[PDB]
Amino acid sequence: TQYGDITPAKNSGSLVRVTSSATAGTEVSGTVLFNVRNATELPWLSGQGSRYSKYRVRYAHFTWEPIVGSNTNGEVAMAMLYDVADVTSITIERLMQTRGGTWGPIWSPTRKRLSYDPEHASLPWYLSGVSSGAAAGNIQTPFQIAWAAQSSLVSTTLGRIMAEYLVELTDPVDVTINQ
Amino acid sequence: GQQPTRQVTPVSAPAAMGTQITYRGPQVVTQYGDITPAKNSGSLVRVTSSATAGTEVSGTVLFNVRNATELPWLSGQGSRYSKYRVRYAHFTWEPIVGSNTNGEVAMAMLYDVADVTSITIERLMQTRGGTWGPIWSPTRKRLSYDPEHASLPWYLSGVSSGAAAGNIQTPFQIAWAAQSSLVSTTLGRIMAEYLVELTDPVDVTINQ
């Protein structure tokens, strides 16, 4: 197969901004879908997912980016999920029991990054689509990043979750038709 | 000429101490005999400050193959076996607070599911396994289980309600107490790495 058939998208960026609960010390959870179509958290990537039919993730590393001082009193955790249907009960003690679970103090930048395991992809090429539904979801997104944090600080942004990746897109499509 | 007159040791404290922890996965292997070793680690308790500043907070945890609350993973294993015993279990303190903070923490080991009241720091310090230290710093000495003194060669994977029944199904409990000038703030977590040996398989439905 010739050159060009696969287009690599290598870049990084802020996945999400993690901000504390309005009630001091209350865990805050979240789940982020890794898509070429998640325009909210993967803008740069989304602008391309939209113009290609299929895609696959070559590699993706996630890390915690703190933006609060050393005296802050919080904790953070991340793990990788592979079922779009898994969206509840995201607690810290649970992420610490699921694949890649990384926990640490709020002020500390992640040392041992969390990474995608491609050799276990549920399928060769995922679809650049938006069809709602659990099944449809798992066929359009390879994995998700579950996270949970907590802090005595009230309604303050603690930091972000960074992502350094490289994904390959294939089969160009018209932005409009492709939706 | 002569020997030294004193011994100087440089001491220092950072703005904040802590620990990052990445989960690698549980370790399970079937072996000859009926023995099958389950190894794992994770968070045990989320220790949070008292609503009244400086007041002590406390509690205890049952070490069970069927304690779905704190040892969820282990429960999955426990549900399929009839008996078990602990090879080793080590508990440790992990700070979420800066060194600026005031307070202290302590934990020890109990061997009677019934003893669950009057837990306090000064009291845990005189209980076997006593570990402690300023709240803001990870615990140096860890808390380890002592299987040579187990009351039962093999404990039961059951859920019967009694106090005795509890002691026949639980080899020990983790008592802990802490206090801090902070108010209703999560001070840190107690981590655990352990290895238990399950034996005598049984259908989960029946094992209840």
Add this chain to the structure above:
Amino acid sequence: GQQPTRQVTPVSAPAAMGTQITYRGPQVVTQYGDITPAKNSGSLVRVTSSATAGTEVSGTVLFNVRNATELPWLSGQGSRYSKYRVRYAHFTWEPIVGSNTNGEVAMAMLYDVADVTSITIERLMQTRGGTWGPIWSPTRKRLSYDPEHASLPWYLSGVSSGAAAGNIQTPFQIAWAAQSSLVSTTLGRIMAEYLVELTDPVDVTINQ
């Protein structure tokens, strides 16, 4: 028996991190060809907080042999040569603040003298060269120029006003953005070590 279940890493933060820097002097050498390598280092920008706490501050710097504002030394060289090109250029963040402080910083590389608006942290993070981190800590990964992708084998030592003229005289720019809870306080500086090759001498008066 088995492998580990987790991986523990001790983490810590000092009251304040920083860097002392002593200037050793610029390095210049004439060589065969018309090539003459200029090597130097220094401060690029003095990054100072917004008057409105927490608000983002930003800006960009043109990499020029004739940017008397931020690269004064390099200007002296630029004024005497007609063309040049960058061998390497690395930029880095240096904190003047204690670890107690809140905020973050980020920088990346741009290649069009015209793109100088809408600079923000979240946006620099998705731009080539993106580096970032809590404001109080020196930047681990540095920002380096990529000469293999230069648009011109040799750029011009000129000062013409156009946007195109600007791109013909500037191989790249440094975008950066930062925010902090502090108000109108100088957060730190962006340092730079670089090496450029000047060529084709010319009387300074005329080179303008």
Add this chain to the structure above:
Amino acid sequence: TQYGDITPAKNSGSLVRVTSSATAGTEVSGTVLFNVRNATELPWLSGQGSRYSKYRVRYAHFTWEPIVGSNTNGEVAMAMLYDVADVTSITIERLMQTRGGTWGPIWSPTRKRLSYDPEHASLPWYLSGVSSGAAAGNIQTPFQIAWAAQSSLVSTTLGRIMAEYLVELTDPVDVTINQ
């Protein structure tokens, strides 16, 4: 790539006629753009620049051609510039400080010729165009020849500046469209 795609234009010719100031002994300056489009000083070359899109200079040597006797009292100088914007303050003492600067007595034919340095070209292929402007200028012309002379003689032509070159043109264009 096949034969013919690049057309070599090898030739020489008079660049400019240098004539003295009306006021005896006053330096006279000048700047000549090396273009496939400078019809005033590079006629032969210009007639081709006009019918090709891009081009590059393989080599170019400049020399002073005196046409006045040994008793004449003047001096001449040349140097090479690479910014179309550099057009003022062209004095002899300055050319003698810029690349290739060659100075000598008026009656004497240049010995050590001035030459273009291709390995330093600002770009691979220059454009055969006429768009005015500094930037546009530098993209259409690779370099210029700055010169300055002076002589007690009044308003008399001292000599010429010769050019022996070889430039390669590429991409034919219609003479009209190309402007």
Add this chain to the structure above:
Amino acid sequence: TQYGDITPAKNSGSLVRVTSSATAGTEVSGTVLFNVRNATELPWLSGQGSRYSKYRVRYAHFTWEPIVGSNTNGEVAMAMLYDVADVTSITIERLMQTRGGTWGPIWSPTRKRLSYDPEHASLPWYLSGVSSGAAAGNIQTPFQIAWAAQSSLVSTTLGRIMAEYLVELTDPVDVTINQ
């Protein structure tokens, strides 16, 4: 030449007290002349400069002495100048481009000290004098210490600039005549 003809003055002391601007975050500059006659900042030394005609500096090391806590938000810089006439535009980014320039955080005591380079002295023996004027100045003082600092703190003394030196004096003079 016999013993005694040269008198060594070895000692150290506080050069200057660096105090912040009344307007938070405004750089504060300064220049200190290294004299046997600068009674304001080199008292101990000055009391001898006054009674000797000439002198030279064997060695001199300067360092930053902070007196404010780790949480302070400032920066400091020093460099060495050799022209008494150089007294303006003393900014941090500039000191960092001049000889020996040392920059660092406000709370941190200098590690790599700044030192005088005797082998480059403009002259063998300097004069213990006070005559005003640029020239006269450069003949009485071998060098100066330029410094600049800034801090969010308002009108507070940040620290001092220390000096550990050894200078040789020669040719005793009457304190009065010598002025």
